[PDB]
Amino acid sequence: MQEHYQPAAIEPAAQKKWDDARISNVSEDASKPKYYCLSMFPYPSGKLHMGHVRNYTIGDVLSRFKLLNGFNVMQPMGWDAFGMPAENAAMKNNVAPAAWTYDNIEYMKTQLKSLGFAVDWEREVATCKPEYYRWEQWLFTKLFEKGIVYRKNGTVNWDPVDQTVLANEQVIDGRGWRSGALIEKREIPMYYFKITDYAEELLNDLDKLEHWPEQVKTMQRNWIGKSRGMTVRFAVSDDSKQGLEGDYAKFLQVYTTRPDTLMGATYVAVAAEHPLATAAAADKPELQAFIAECKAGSVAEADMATMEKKGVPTGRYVVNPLNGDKLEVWIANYVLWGYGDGAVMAVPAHDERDFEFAAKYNLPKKQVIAVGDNAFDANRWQEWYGDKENGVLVNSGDLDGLDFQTAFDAVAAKLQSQGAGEPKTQYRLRDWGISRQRYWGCPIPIVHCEKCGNVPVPADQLPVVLPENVVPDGMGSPLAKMPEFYETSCPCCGGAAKRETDTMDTFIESSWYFFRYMSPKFSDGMVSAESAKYWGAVDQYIGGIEHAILHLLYARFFTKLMRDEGLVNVDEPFERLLTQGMVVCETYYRENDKDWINPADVELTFDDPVSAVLKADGLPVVISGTEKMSKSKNNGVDPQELINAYGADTARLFMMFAAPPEQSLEWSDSGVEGAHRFLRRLWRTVYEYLKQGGAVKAFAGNQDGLSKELKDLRHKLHSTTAKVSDDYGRRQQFNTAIAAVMELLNQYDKTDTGSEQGRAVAQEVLEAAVRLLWPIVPHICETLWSELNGAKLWEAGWPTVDEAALVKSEIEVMVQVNGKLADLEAAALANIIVVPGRLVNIVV
């Protein structure tokens, strides 16, 4: 055994050892219990970053833990290949997106392999390959025929200078982020998934997910935003019907979730697009400008609550059907045309948004709810104003004294009898638009024929192949400028026709890839029936919390779609969900005429730390704040340089030890040094142990007659095995498992293991430690295990807890007072000559 730990020697040999034995190349083996551990597959954007290493290390810890416990473990990897990165790389480098993508894949695949992840590379998929995306084209056509996918006109932000559609997050002050030109809102036909048809299923099935973090479930419930409220109609007043046609001349209809406060409504508010807004504004230039400023707005939903709410009175009036109050209609910028009826009532006393709106414009506030003897201050909001559960109605006439639920049904009965309203269930969730006006994505399998309409490509003709020898312009989607691609013949009539040139939302590829891993070479469908039945669902899923809403909701949706097609046998794709935090790092710059400097290029001073300096020279640097690793502040530490400097095991140890998965991990040079120094110590402990006499059979069985010191070390060992097992299995906190193995070795360090029995216990200690740590640092553990023991480590299995080692010793002595019934004296006085271990007599 080499004296000094040298990872560049041992790590490739171990990787070859695992690969030769094919421990990760798994099949549908009915004799071993399956375990499907999945990390979110990466965008192939060039190189691994520290987030990647953290995520796939967490995945591999859990995989190897289950492997050592005898499961048939599938841990597959692949490439989420379509999307904008390749498009912009094409624009900057004048290379094809595909060629750039396949090169990134080759380089990142090498990096993952050098880290030693126990991955079944025979199940590798790349979603930009027609062998993959043909199957989502297949499902698309099938759902299109059923109407689950449909084509509808929708409005988008057009940038007229850069000639492309822009996401709403990509609009600042009504202008495109790169171009800086005023965006134009335009109506174009687009494709939608009818996800709202599955809203109630998607909402309710969350309750099944007992091993998901509650905050993820809460975020999904809120995103779906189901509510049971009331449709309420207010009759338009005699004087306010000018310019209105239809039922809009008769009433204004609103939806509210608080009909128990209908007695407290003090005004009503409508969207800028509402007919009442249009008729009111026809002779009022200030209203026309307000209507225009609303329509020009572009507020993404994470910013709708954070925008200043503004309104304009219209001079038009409606009547509360329950008390008779004439109420003014306002136009307001928070009422969205498309949600509900584009019209709401306002109760400033019991809705905080209405409170603030009414405070701004000095609109009335009428308290109709009371919670105990709480004082109502019409000038200061209080939390209890919005209380649904423990409130009771006041100032409501014949409704006074009712709680929320019985008031709700009382209002519902009154409204329904006179025809002024009825209960209604609503959902915030919108349908999912999948059209993208972009090149590097899966083609939409629709052929447009002026005789036959929107026609799906027949299954015999799929895939519609994206041509790969394209170098994106900049001036619009290339597919629309390629007659060689879109000029085709119609599949139903055989005449001249045009392919759809929009591509699919790349969220689609990541909504089913976990099923494709089950049979990635299956040419007859999305997933083979036999494989889906064996593998079932993902047992454990690991990824970043930033995917908690959209990606997770889309994947659950696709699972239910595929189940209903008859392809899979599960309702939910992901049983356990572990969300990983971000990686942060200090930032450094230097002022010019700021140019942010990468940390691996900087060197720090010290004392016994003054400042920092650039490695290439010696000019000082500006140490600034710690934040997430990014291109923006050039504070991303290349994982390749960590591996080059210390080896894969040190990289993995640092990430697992520095922070629990949910927590932000802070890059630290000394921390990485600490992890490397522990691996040297681990190496030194085994080497010194074997230097003093070589391996022996590990201690096992009855421990009576072992010295107290060695019994104590066995107690620490088997308590450490139980702790680490609970840390990997239940808590999924890996730092405390490393700490526990560290404590075991510390106790071993202070124990004389030189005797014959001492060596046997030492062998037991070391054979456990290297297996307890193997999921985390498998290369050094693999090599150390082969020096201690000839059996194959994965066949030796997870260390067992020897409960006999956890039973503390017993000695029963009698205690008598005047002849009749240090260590034992203090305990018997807690109940004087002492005959050792047998008897004590309290002579008094």
Ligand X SMILES: CCCCCc1ccc(-c2cn(CCC[C@@H]3CO[C@H](COS(=O)(=O)NC(=O)[C@@H](N)CC(C)C)[C@@H](O)[C@H]3O)nn2)cc1
Binding site for ligand X (CB under 6 A): 40-43, 47, 49-52, 55, 80, 510, 543-544, 546-547, 551, 580, 582-583, 629-631, 636
Amino acid at 791: A
Contact call for residues 737 and 772 (beta carbons, < 8 A): yes
Tell me the C-alpha distance between 280 and 243, whole Å: 8
Number of residues lying near Zn ion (CB under 5 A): 6
Q: Residue 271 binds what, of ligand X, Zn ion, none (CB under 5 to 8 Å, by partner type)? A: none
Which residue number, 3 or 546, has a Cβ lying nearer to ligand X? 546
Question: Could you tell which of ligand X, Zn ion, none binds residue 80, using a CB distance below 5 to 8 A set by kind?
Answer: ligand X
CB neighbour class for 793 (10 Å; exposed up to 12, middle 13-18, buried from 19)? buried
Q: Which residues contact 144 (CB under 8 A, 6 or more apart)?
A: 150, 446, 456
Q: In terms of CB distance, is 420 or 648 closer to ligand X?
A: 648
H or E segment at 711?
helix 708-726
Number of H helices, E strands in the chain: 24, 35
Query: Which among 297, 390, 408, 276 has a CA at the least distance from the CA of 342?
Result: 276
Element (H, E) at 773: helix 756-773
> In the bound complex, what is the minimum distance in angstroms from residue 459's beta carbon to Zn ion?
18
Helix, strand, coil percentages, rounded to 5, for the chain: 40, 20, 40
Name the strand (E) or helix (H) holding 100.
helix 97-114
Nearer to ligand X among residue 28 and residue 638 (C-beta): 638
Scored b (16 or more CB within 10 A) or e, 165-196 reads bbeeebbeeebbeeeeeebeeeeeebbbbebe
Contact partner, 640, from ligand X, Zn ion, none, Cβ < 5-8 Å per class: none
Query: What character string, x for contact with Zn ion (CB under 5 A) and - otherwise, covers 438-457?
Result: -----------x-xx-----
Using an 8 Å Cβ cutoff, are 590 and 621 in contact? yes
Q: Which is nearer to ligand X, 50 or 319 (CB)?
A: 50
Minimum Å distance from CB 540 to ligand X? 13
Which residue's CB is nearer to Zn ion, number 146 or number 451?
451
Smallest distance, Zn ion to C-beta of residue 447, A:
8
> Which phi-psi region, left, alpha or beta, contains residue 116 (left: φ > 0; alpha: ψ -120 to 50)?
left
CB 56 within 8 A of CB 117: yes
- Residue among 495, 540, 492, 488 at smallest CA distance from 514: 540
Query: Choosing among ligand X, Zn ion, none, which partner's interface includes residue 87 (Cβ < 5 to 8 Å by kind)?
Result: none
Q: Which does 449 bind (CB under 5 to 8 A by kind): ligand X, Zn ion, none?
A: Zn ion
510 binds, among ligand X, Zn ion, none (CB under 5 to 8 A by kind): ligand X
841 contact choice in Zn ion, ligand X, none (CB below 5 to 8 Å, kind-dependent): none
Residue 52 interaction partner, one of ligand X, Zn ion, none, beta carbon < 5-8 Å per kind: ligand X
Q: Which does 452 bind (CB under 5 to 8 A by kind): Zn ion, ligand X, none?
A: Zn ion
In angstroms, what is the minimal distance from the CB of 495 to Zn ion?
A: 5
To Zn ion, the closest distance from the beta carbon of 490 in angstroms equals: 3
Given ligand X, Zn ion, none, residue 40, with its beta carbon under 5 to 8 Å by kind, binds ligand X
> Strand 34-39's sheet: what is its strand order?
72-74, 34-39, 538-544, 574-580
Rounded alpha-carbon distances, angstroms, from residue 90 to 49, 84, 99, 105, 339: 21, 10, 9, 16, 40
Nearest approach, Cβ of residue 452 and Zn ion (Å): 3
**Cβ distance to ligand X smaller for residue 50 or 504:** 50
Q: Smallest gap, in angstroms, from Cβ of residue 633 to ligand X? A: 10
Beta bridge partners of 190: 152
Which residue is at the shortest CB distance from ligand X? 544
Residue 685's binding partner, choosing from Zn ion, ligand X, none, with beta-carbon cut-off 5 to 8 A by kind?
Answer: none
Q: How far is the CB of 442 from ligand X (least distance, A)?
A: 15
For residue 308, what are its two tokens?
């200043």
Per partner kind, with CB cut-offs from 5 to 8 A, the member of ligand X, Zn ion, none near residue 16 is none
Q: Which is nearer to ligand X, 547 or 714 (CB)?
A: 547
Residue 151 Cβ vs Zn ion, minimum distance, rounded to whole Å: 16
Q: How far apart are CA 639 and CA 629, in angstroms?
A: 12
Please, which residue, 51 or 311, has the CB nearer to ligand X?
A: 51
Residue 451 binding: pick among Zn ion, ligand X, none (C-beta 5-8 Å cut-off by kind) = Zn ion
Q: How far is the CB of 486 from Zn ion (least distance, A)?
A: 15
Report which of 365, 333, 372 is spatially closest to residue 350, judged by C-alpha positions: 365
Q: Is residue 493 near Zn ion by the rule CB under 5 A? A: yes
Q: Which residue has the tokens 């007992």?
A: 210
Q: Which is nearer to ligand X, 546 or 673 (CB)?
A: 546
Q: How far is the CB of 450 from Zn ion (least distance, A)?
A: 8
Tokens of 316: 């038009």
Q: Which is nearer to ligand X, 257 or 630 (CB)?
A: 630
Q: Pairing relation of β-strands 814-817 and 839-842?
A: parallel
Q: Is the dihedral of CA 457, 461, 462, 467 positive or negative?
A: negative
Q: Among residues 490, 542, 765, 824, which is the contact residue for Zn ion, using CB under 5 A?
A: 490
Q: Shortest approach of ligand X to residue 201 CB, angstroms?
A: 22
Q: What are residue 325's phi and psi, to 5 degrees? A: -60, 130
Half-sphere exposure of 654 (CA within 13 A, CB side): 26
Least gap, CB of 116 to ligand X (angstroms)? 17
Of 488 and 630, the one with the shorter C-beta distance to ligand X is 630
Question: Given the rule CB under 5 A, which residues bind Zn ion?
Answer: 449, 451-452, 490, 492-493
